[PDB]
Design a protein around this ligand. Structure first.
Ligand SMILES: *[C@@H]1O[C@H](CO)[C@@H](O[C@@H]2O[C@H](CO)[C@@H](O[C@@H]3O[C@H](CO[C@H]4O[C@H](CO)[C@@H](O)[C@H](O[C@H]5O[C@H](CO)[C@@H](O)[C@H](O)[C@@H]5O[C@H]5O[C@H](CO)[C@@H](O)[C@H](O)[C@@H]5O)[C@@H]4O)[C@@H](O)[C@H](O[C@H]4O[C@H](CO)[C@@H](O)[C@H](O)[C@@H]4O[C@H]4O[C@H](CO)[C@@H](O)[C@H](O)[C@@H]4O)[C@@H]3O)[C@H](O)[C@H]2NC(C)=O)[C@H](O)[C@H]1NC(C)=O
Ligand SMILES: O=C(c1cc(OCC2CCOCC2)nc(C2CC2)c1)N1CC2=C(C1)CN(C(=O)N1CCc3c(O)noc3C1)C2
Ligand SMILES: [Ca+2]
Ligand SMILES: [Cl-]
Ligand SMILES: [K+]
Ligand code: NA
Ligand SMILES: [Zn+2]
Length: 805
């Protein structure tokens, strides 16, 4: 109930909401059908349009007009945005040359530069180049300010999940808005685009920017606009808010445009009908900037122009139907479209089995345009699993396609030629970032970055302390002239032990054997020096990683590699080695095929054993430093140490062997040496965070040897590839992956073929940021470089995506 008989006189676009049954006058009241009776008359005036004309100049104030050309309008704060151009011979902001804003040039009484966030739905990154002739205001912002060639949305690349990621710095799994459509079983409720349930606060986790601002005494303009409120009125309302007295004036403002998403759905991303919506967004930007210039705020305010996601070509005929795969298609609920989420239609059906559904969807058709996953098997870079609202079964749908349940769902609902929601590495899903103002840099290009990083920056721009989030604070310091946040490396929590030779061969009863009984003081001092860390500067280029939790571990040195060996997990947490451009691949000699050797620096009781592997019929083993890349026949014995051993399903060893035997060498050749850090990951509860021992669900049978869920590698070299990796004087270049450790290769539909036809494609799918690996391991990499910490943080957030230009 709303007693809609109160009035909006004097309250148009009021900044505090008021409680039912009092009638409302704020920018959201329409959407709650709670505006007072006179809201349209008083607050949504349209008379005479939005631009001054010559004949309106000097006019007698008529309060019915939408905006004013009278002489008192600047002081009233309600001129049309073009008032000074038409009536005072001033130029449009876009027509002025751009001049560096070295300091904020603000009116008296402004305590800090305001922030205005201009967000555009569906603004695909390539629109900046492809639409540049029709968006001159936006291009001025872009080329005078700071810009990225694109910004990476989060998965799914839907509107609500991304807008709220922009608001919070959080992955959808953490903030709760895991789709545009959702079911929450604890609430027993559903969240739809259409309706009232989405306004209930319990869907929305984290702490969005407006709440962060409010709690720390920064005033926020209300971010959300009811869809009927036209764009021109939203701009004028912001400009009016900026004229408020110092004690009532907000410091942060938001404008949201439904375009160009709305049209892109209809016409496709590059449909000829798309030119006009781009013109119109540009015109709106023009109005804002002309409005700010009138208020002498155009060298005071920081303006962010940011998109939520791009848009891709998608038509009804490119739909896959689950009815062409499953027999039991009525026993499932599908959340459909550019991604697929499947659950049981009824929780009183005990005959529902996800395993059989997945198998019925796996590699069934040769050209298949989706891939099923249990959510915990999705690529870790998507961070799309740790929420009750994400269904156990997920379909990653190919770009340009839809998935639906039955054909009746497509025709009883072609209409659309554009959609989004695909994997966030897809080019067509990328979106835009431009920052313009005193706090942003002048004429600067920055590298692409992920939209989860922006919450921190917006907090920096307003002098707020960010709530805990998934950004890496400092990774975008390079966007900012000032207001930088100066981060420090986390403290190491556990220091290593450096064990020497403490145990005799015969103390070990591991069931391991090695044909190594083959015996010189020249090469005996030499190997002592290799066990004490003589070659470590070669193999450990960036310092040892820091262990950020309490544990017991040993640094072990070898001729070709260095490891941090965990007495708790009975394996390395990390193995570091350098492979030069010139290095050579050998094979494992025949006599050493099954060779595993006791490590005389580590007790039997903190060692794996071979018997467990023999008794575990599912589980085999592999090595972290590969025997194939040994520098000499003698050094190769080090690679068969029990302390280099890790558990591997036979199906995973095909992947791992190919990576170690072929791909490491290929990368060394191409990148002029590489440093490699490899290791295990345990994420049984799929939260993206390092497991404690008591969370491990699987061990090598009859042993305390825990089974990793994944294996990682971080592959570093010199960005200037004319310098070798081991003697790089400048910035670094990195690619990483987090491979799922799976007992089959069902994910790769061509896995019965040679490893050269599928292994690399799989690795690409599971590309990762170093930072993802940090979360999953509790390690901190790149502790000892000559590079600034900001630059390293930027490096740690880099993702190698393998899309073309
Ligand atoms: C990305 O960044 C984010 C933010 O930094 C990271 O997420 C944080 O991770 C922390 C560690 O996992 C986590 O800390 C826990 O908080 C528990 C209390 O949390 C409440 O309060 C906070 C603070 O305001 C609030 O934000 C939380 O909101 C969550 O839940 C509501 C739903 O009720 C949602 O609206 C909201 O979206 C959010 O949901 C998300 O997070 C929860 C986890 O909190 C997930 O389960 C959801 O799926 C969803 O993703 C909460 O309202 C606190 O109780 C925990 O403490 C337990 O564990 C500690 C270990 O130190 C142990 O010592 C304690 O004994 C305690 O155990 C007890 O409870 C156990 C479980 O019931 C029980 O088994 C035990 O026996 C004990 O009884 C813990 O400290 C923090 O909440 C989240 N924050 C957010 C916003 O998600 C995220 O990790 C980053 N991602 C990556 C990949 O790095
Ligand atoms: O005002 C907001 C808004 C704006 C908003 O900014 C947050 C800012 C945080 C700081 O950084 C910049 C963004 N945050 C929210 C939610 C997260 C808290 C909401 N609205 C969004 C939408 C509408 C208006 C209408 N609507 C649709 O018509 N579609 C529904 C979604 C959709 C789709 O996926 N494709 O077409 C459509 C059509 C989506
Ligand atoms: Ca975990
Ligand atoms: Cl969705
Ligand atoms: K075995
Ligand atoms: Na397969
Ligand atoms: Zn859309």
């Amino acid at each position: 109930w709303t007693a809609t008989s109160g009035s909006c006189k004097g309250r148009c676009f009021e900044l505090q909401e008021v409680g039912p049954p009092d009638c409302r006058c704020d920018n959201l009241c329409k959407s709650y059908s709670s505006c007072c009776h006179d809201f349209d008359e008083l607050c949504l005036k349209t008379a005479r349009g939005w631009e001054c004309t010559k004949d309106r100049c000097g006019e007698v104030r008529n309060e019915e007009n939408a905006c004013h050309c009278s002489e008192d309008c600047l002081s009233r704060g309600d001129c049309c945005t073009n008032y000074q151009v038409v009536c005072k011979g001033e130029s449009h902001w876009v027509d002025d040359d751009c001049e560096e804003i070295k300091v904020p040039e603000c009116p008296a009484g402004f305590v800090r530069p305001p922030l205005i966030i201009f967000s555009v739905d569906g603004f695909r990154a390539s629109y900046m180049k492809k639409g540049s002739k029709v968006m001159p205001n936006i291009e001025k912002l872009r080329s005078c300010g700071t810009h990225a060639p694109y910004m990476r949305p989060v998965y799914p690349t839907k509107t609500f999940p991304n807008l709220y990621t922009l608001a919070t710095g959080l992955y959808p799994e953490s903030h709760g808005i895991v789709g545009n459509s959702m079911y929450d079983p604890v609430f027993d409720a559903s969240f739809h685009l259409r309706g009232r349930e989405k306004f209930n606060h319990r869907w929305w986790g984290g702490q969005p920017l407006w709440i962060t601002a409010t709690k720390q005494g920064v005033r926020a303009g209300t971010f959300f606009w009811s869809v009927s409120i036209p764009h021109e009125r939203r701009i004028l309302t912001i400009l009016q808010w900026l004229s408020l007295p110092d004690n009532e004036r907000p410091s942060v403002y938001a404008f949201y445009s439904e375009q160009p998403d709305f049209s892109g759905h209809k016409y496709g991303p590059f449909g000829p009908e798309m030119t006009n919506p781009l013109r119109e967004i540009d015109k709106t930007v023009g109005q804002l900037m002309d409005g700010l210039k009138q208020l002498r705020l155009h060298r005071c305010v920081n303006v962010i122009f940011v998109g939520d996601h791009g848009m891709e070509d998608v038509t009804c005929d490119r739909t896959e139907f689950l009815s062409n795969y499953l027999t039991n298609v009525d026993d499932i609920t599908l959340v459909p479209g550019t991604l697929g989420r499947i659950r049981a239609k009824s929780i009183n059906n005990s005959k529902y089995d996800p395993k059989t559904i997945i198998a019925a969807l796996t590699c069934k058709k040769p050209d298949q345009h989706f891939k099923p996953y249990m959510k915990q098997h999705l690529p870790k870079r998507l961070h799309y699993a740790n929420n009750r609202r994400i269904e156990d079964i997920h379909l990653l749908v190919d770009r340009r396609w839809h998935v639906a349940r039955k054909p009746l769902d497509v025709y009883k609902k072609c209409f659309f030629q554009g959609d989004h929601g695909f994997d966030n590495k897809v080019n067509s899903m990328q979106t835009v970032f431009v920052g313009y103002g005193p706090t942003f840099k002048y004429r600067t290009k920055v590298p692409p970055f992920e939209n989860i990083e922006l919450y921190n920056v917006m907090c920096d721009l307003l002098g707020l302390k960010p709530a805990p989030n998934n950004g890496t604070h400092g990774s975008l310091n390079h966007l900012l002239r000032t207001n930088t946040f100066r981060p420090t490396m986390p403290d190491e929590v556990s220091r290593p032990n450096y064990p020497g030779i403490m145990y005799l061969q015969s103390e070990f009863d591991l069931g391991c054997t090695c044909d190594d009984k083959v015996e010189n003081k020249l090469e005996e001092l030499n190997k002592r020096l290799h066990t004490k860390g003589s070659t470590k500067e070669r193999h450990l280029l960036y310092g040892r990683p820091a262990v950020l939790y309490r544990t017991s571990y040993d640094i072990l040195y070898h001729t070709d590699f260095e490891s941090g060996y965990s007495e708790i997990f009975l394996m390395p947490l990390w193995t570091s080695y350098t492979i030069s451009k010139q290095a050579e691949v050998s094979s494992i000699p025949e006599h050493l095929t099954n060779c595993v050797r006791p490590d005389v620096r580590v007790s039997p009781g903190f060692s794996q054993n071979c018997l467990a592997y023999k008794n575990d019929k599912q589980m085999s083993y592999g090595f972290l430093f590969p025997p194939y890349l040994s520098s000499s026949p003698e050094a190769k014995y080090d690679a068969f140490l029990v302390t280099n051993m890790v558990p591997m399903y036979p199906a995973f060893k095909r992947v791992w062997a190919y990576f170690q035997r072929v791909l490491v060498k290929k990368y060394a050749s191409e990148r002029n040496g590489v440093n490699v850090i490899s290791g295990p990951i345990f994420d049984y509860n799929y939260d993206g965070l390092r497991d404690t021992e008591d969370e491990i669900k699987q061990y090598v049978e009859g042993s305390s040897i825990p089974v990793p869920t994944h294996y990682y590698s971080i592959i570093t070299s010199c960005l200037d590839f004319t310098q070798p990796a081991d003697k790089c004087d400048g910035p670094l270049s990195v690619s990483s992956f987090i491979l799922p450790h799976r007992p089959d290769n069902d994910e790769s539909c061509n896995s019965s073929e040679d490893e050269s036809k599928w292994v690399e494609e799989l690795m690409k799918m599971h590309t990762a940021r170093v930072r993802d690996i940090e979360h999953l391991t509790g390690l901190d990499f790149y502790r000892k470089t000559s590079r600034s910490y900001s630059e390293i943080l930027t490096l740690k957030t880099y993702l190698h995506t393998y899309e073309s230009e």
